[PDB]
Amino acid sequence: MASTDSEKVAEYLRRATLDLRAARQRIRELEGEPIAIVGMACRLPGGVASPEDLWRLVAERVDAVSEFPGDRGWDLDSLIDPDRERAGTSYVGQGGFLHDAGEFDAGFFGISPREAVAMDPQQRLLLETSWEALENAGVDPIALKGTDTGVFSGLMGQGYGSGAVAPELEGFVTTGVASSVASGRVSYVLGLEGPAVTVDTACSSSLVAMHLAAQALRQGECSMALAGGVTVMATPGSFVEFSRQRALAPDGRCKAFAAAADGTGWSEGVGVVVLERLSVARERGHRILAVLRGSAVNQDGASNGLTAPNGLSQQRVIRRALAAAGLAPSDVDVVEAHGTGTTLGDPIEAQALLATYGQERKQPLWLGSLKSNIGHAQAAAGVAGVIKMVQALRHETLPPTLHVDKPTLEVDWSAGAIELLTEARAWPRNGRPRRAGVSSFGVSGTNAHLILEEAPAEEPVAAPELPVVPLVVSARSTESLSGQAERLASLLEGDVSLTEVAGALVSRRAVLDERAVVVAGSREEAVTGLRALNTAGSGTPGKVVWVFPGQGTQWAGMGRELLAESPVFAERIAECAAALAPWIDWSLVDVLRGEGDLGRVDVLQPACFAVMVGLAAVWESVGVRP
Amino acid sequence: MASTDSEKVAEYLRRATLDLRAARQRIRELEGEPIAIVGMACRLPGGVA
């Protein structure tokens, strides 16, 4: 009783391999699954309020260095000093600034103006940008309440409101200056339940936060996550301090990798992105902007100073990032260098990039730096750069670099196949994937590196245009409704599908108190009606009564159009006619089509009954009930 | 030729279980390994050092 095994062993142990190969796949997917980007938002100096604005600004090689702000309460005359070495002075007067830093909408978030006054500007900017980023992703923020999504933010203290505080404004000073409240306020107003951590790691904070978020998504702690950074200056102390170090260029413009680089220039901004696991993003039907593959972070270590960099650490972090991403040094095509513009950092960074990337290259790679266009955004720098690269993948065009005449002579440019980017280039799809790299090295010593890849190709689906479609727009205030209507009218002036925008507006958007709807059949009529819209109502619901009238509301050919376009009404009319068929000698459907006589009252009264019943049925269909 | 196939199949596909069970243990230890403490230091009020 031991010979009946030959077939059973094979049948049993085929399942062994088939089943336990899945575990081997799962270990790889848990160690190195790619992350998907499903939404971005940002604002930067130069009037930028959306990623499209940033792409437009970059594509036409326009800088945005401006004058000092005068509305923040600074003392311009005493601070500004062309003399380099006068006590308590700065020898620069340029830079990038957000002239709308103080603007905020307190009523939208249910915050009294007295609270808003004591609130730090970074909290307000983070709130607004987070809401904008969530709206961009096409996910309803209201329905997002109660889930387990997480937030990660990068910011540093600035000493806002460090002077005397009046008792009237006293009450929310402590809660409006702290750092944990930056994520606490978002998790409070949105009702989230995932981890909320704020990380301060000098100028490389934001990417580090992103890195942390990725790890959480791999651990299963959270399903949704959003990461970003923010920086706005409240006091000019940094300007004076770095002026005493003679590290700021007199012009205030950062000439990255140029032969005439002599300093840097500070700036401000804020950026936020939303991250997802690739499989979950495919399952939920979102759209993929780009894919983050791998990342790494380490420390400068023992160097020639507390602030001096080290090339070996940068080389090591680049190799670690490439190994984690599972790629090769010859696969990337463009790297967004740090490009701070110092007389020391640029040669070291160029030498490191030559050492690691500029080897065995069949085709030379390119590099650029957004800092030449905007400046040093500090904690909000890296995220901004990331956004730029994403746009470069979507528009299939290499952006140019500004403020370059000759490459710096402190390095040997012949050591590798790497060359600067001074003119726009075409970056089309060619079968092989397109990849990019992002770098950021902080003052404290930490360094980061990120690898981005184009979104997977997808096929489009053709749809037929509907004859007549509604357009519903909702907001929280009347002025916001007017702004929404104006923006929609501006959008519809282009070449877009009315059905597409109507479906997106009805499905990918929230619902609020103030409401306004229009009906359209063509784009021109739609925009005309939207511009002419002046009526809206914030009514309060009560109880609904369905009044059924008497007689005198008849005309031959009532439902011939409705039977021809409304399926539920047509089916109800047909079913009612079939029910009434045995005890009648006509066809009610043909009677209402235009083949009936009003004289036959035995057809008249049932006609009114049937049209009333069908009108009730179609009302039920839309989702309202008596 | 192929008559002694039972022994071949058994010894071929025993290795699959033997090693892929180790793979399963590897994923379990990757997602749930304990972390040990080897050193501490503290300074608290009351003369504690």
Partner: antibody
Framework: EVQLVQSGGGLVQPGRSLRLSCTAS????????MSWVRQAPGKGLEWVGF??????????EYAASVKGRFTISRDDSKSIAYLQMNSLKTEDTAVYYC?????????WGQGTLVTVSS | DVVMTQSPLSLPVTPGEPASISCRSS???????????LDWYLQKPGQSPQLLIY???NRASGVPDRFSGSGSGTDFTLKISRVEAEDVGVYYC??????????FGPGTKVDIKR
């Protein structure tokens, strides 16, 4: 992705015949064996029959209690398993499942209810 | 010479605690090649059956990792580290040394302790 769908149920009168079909997809159907099992209402499970694969002769085996009345056929070209209910009785009213594999019951279908009552 | 296997009829279980089910036999199932021939099947109410464990101490895919099996010779044991609400059903300990298998046996019921 490994999947299989059962069909061919309903209510039948004693005396005549019926057939049950199972369509498989997502894997190489020409290799695995297919078996049929049945569960009576408010009872357990007991094996009904199975059919071997082509590589092992493509033979069949049926339960002793109901032997000599049922036939199981396979269509590797269309990857469909057919069971032929013949001369049903009142005791045959039950829920039938089709399962991949002869000895190791790996994957199971959605089942199909068959009622025989005069 | 037909091997007969028996298990406790019913065992109420409180969620959050480990549970164990034993399965004996009338003859050792160990073979010359060195494999025990035992399988564990789970049948949820109003659902099709499902495979849990084959060859004594091997767990199939899809099954949550909290299940485990052990034993040898004539005695085997299924152990679950923590019981949830979805684990209510029927469990069957079915041999494979002797073929064909006429029936799956009476099995064991699982419910909520009260």
């Amino acid at each position: 992705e490994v999947q299989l769908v059962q069909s061919g149920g309903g209510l039948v009168q004693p005396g005549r015949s019926l057939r049950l079909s199972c369509t498989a997809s997502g894997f190489t159907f020409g290799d695995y064996a297919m078996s049929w099992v049945r569960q009576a209402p408010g009872k357990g499970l007991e094996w009904v029959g199975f059919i071997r694969s082509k590589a092992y002769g493509g033979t069949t085996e049926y339960a002793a209690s109901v032997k000599g009345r049922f036939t199981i056929s396979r269509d590797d070209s269309k990857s469909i398993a057919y069971l032929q209910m013949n001369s049903l009785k009142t005791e045959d009213t039950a829920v039938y499942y089709c399962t991949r594999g002869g000895t190791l019951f790996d994957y199971w279908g959605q089942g199909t209810l068959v009622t025989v009552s005069s | 010479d037909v091997v007969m296997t028996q298990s406790p009829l019913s065992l109420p279980v409180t969620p959050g605690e480990p549970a164990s089910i034993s399965c004996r036999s009338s003859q050792s199932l160990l073979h010359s090649n060195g494999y025990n021939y035992l399988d564990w099947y789970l049948q949820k109410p109003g659902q099709s059956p499902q495979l849990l464990i084959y060859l004594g101490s091997n767990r199939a895919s899809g099954v949550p990792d909290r299940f485990s099996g052990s034993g040898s010779g004539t005695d085997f044991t299924l152990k679950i580290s923590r019981v949830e609400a979805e684990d209510v059903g029927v469990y069957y300990c079915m041999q494979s040394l002797q073929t064909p298998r006429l029936t799956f046996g009476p099995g064991t019921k699982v419910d909520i302790k009260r």
